């Protein structure tokens, strides 16, 4: 599916960004550094929303199952 594919992409971009920011001097680059942090707190949201949607695309698929057998 396309949701897992994206979740991984985010989780990966976020990681790559993290490591890049860890190589910047927050005291000598407060603006740049603070920006990248803002971008991370964003990705954590996007990634926690994707994760929640997937968990609920399970509940959505799963409802199509118990509906089958024991709706009968």
């Amino acid at each position: 599916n396309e949701l897992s594919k994206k979740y991984l992409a985010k989780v990966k971009e976020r990681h790559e960004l993290k490591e890049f920011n860890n190589s910047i001097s927050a005291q000598d680059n407060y603006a740049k550094w603070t920006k990248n942090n803002r971008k991370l707190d964003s990705l954590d949201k996007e990634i926690n929303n994707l994760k929640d949607e997937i968990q609920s695309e399970n509940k959505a698929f799963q409802a199509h199952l118990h509906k089958l057998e024991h709706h009968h």
């Binding site: 927050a26 005291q27 680059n29 407060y30 603006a31 603070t34 803002r38 707190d41």
Partner: protein, 288 residues
């Protein structure tokens, strides 16, 4: 660009709720004070209240007058009134497995209590306030509550949150100083307010030295400090572009009393300029 002062806020007539917040010894109180004074002078037609929950009870120190539970007109002013109030004492008087744990519950109860107290002040006085200025406490999360007596609460909060989300109705003003640790705490705060959907558009940057434009050019140490302060100003500038960042000067020692608080609060309106405005400060200090 956006103006490097708070003129648009001081003149605004739409705002009922202005919050002043700043962690760690950065000017917060004389900032609360200064804004309140400027607003009141700029809008003589309206009634203003400066209320403070800071446990240091220091509106009284700032004004060198003794305020408290009872809203009282600042002496020598006819539209500014101040109350110092401890909400814990208010909440405790009204009084854990369920409440104690949950965030914003005690926050909200405490808050609602303050509100109630204000209303009581207006009713009895027969006079109402047009705009309050909150001198927030330097530590905590006063407003993290923005996320039968159950319903009663949630219904109150949603009432509040409706007014606090209206940018024309209510805004937050951050205080800080041009130093890494304070700046950091400052962004943290902005972010948190943004999450609550509170308008935040203005940073006050206190204690700046402007050592270049100083005629004493004395202290090699304050020069060296000024270089740090500057260094970060430059960062702040390219990071809160669409913000009103006011760069206030350092008045050495302490600002107390209506007179000097006033003299000083002018630079929130028309940004301070080390060249022309120097004396004003050197005159505040030399008295001290």
């Amino acid at each position: 660009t956006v103006e490097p002062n708070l003129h648009s806020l001081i003149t605004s007539t739409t705002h009922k709720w202005i919050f002043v917040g700043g962690k760690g010894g950065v000017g917060k109180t004389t900032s609360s004070c200064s804004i309140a004074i400027q607003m009141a002078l700029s809008q003589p037609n309206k009634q203003f209240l400066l209320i403070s929950t800071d446990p240091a009870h220091n509106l009284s120190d700032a004004f060198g007058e003794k305020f408290g539970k009872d809203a009282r007109k600042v002496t020598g002013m006819n539209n500014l009134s101040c109350m110092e109030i401890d909400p814990s004492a208010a909440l405790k008087d009204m009084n854990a497995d369920l409440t104690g744990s949950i965030p914003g519950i005690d926050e909200a109860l405490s808050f609602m209590e303050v509100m109630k107290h204000i209303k009581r002040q207006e009713q009895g006085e027969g006079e109402t306030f047009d705009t309050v200025i909150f001198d927030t406490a330097p530590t905590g999360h006063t407003l993290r509550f923005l996320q039968g007596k159950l319903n009663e609460l949630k219904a109150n909060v949603e009432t509040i949150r409706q007014q606090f989300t209206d940018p024309d109705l209510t805004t937050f003003v951050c205080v800080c100083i041009s130093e890494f640790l304070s700046l950091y705490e400052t962004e943290r705060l902005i972010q948190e307010l943004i999450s609550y959907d509170m308008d935040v558009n203005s940073i006050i940057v206190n204690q700046l030295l402007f050592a270049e434009n100083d005629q004493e050019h004395n202290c090699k140490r304050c020069q060296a400090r000024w270089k740090m302060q500057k260094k970060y100003l430059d960062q702040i500038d390219e990071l809160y572009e669409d913000f009103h960042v006011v760069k206030m000067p350092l008045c050495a020692g302490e600002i107390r009393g209506l007179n000097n608080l006033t003299k000083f609060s002018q630079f929130l309106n028309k940004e301070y300029n080390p060249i022309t405005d120097g004396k004003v400060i050197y005159e505040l200090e030399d008295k001290e």
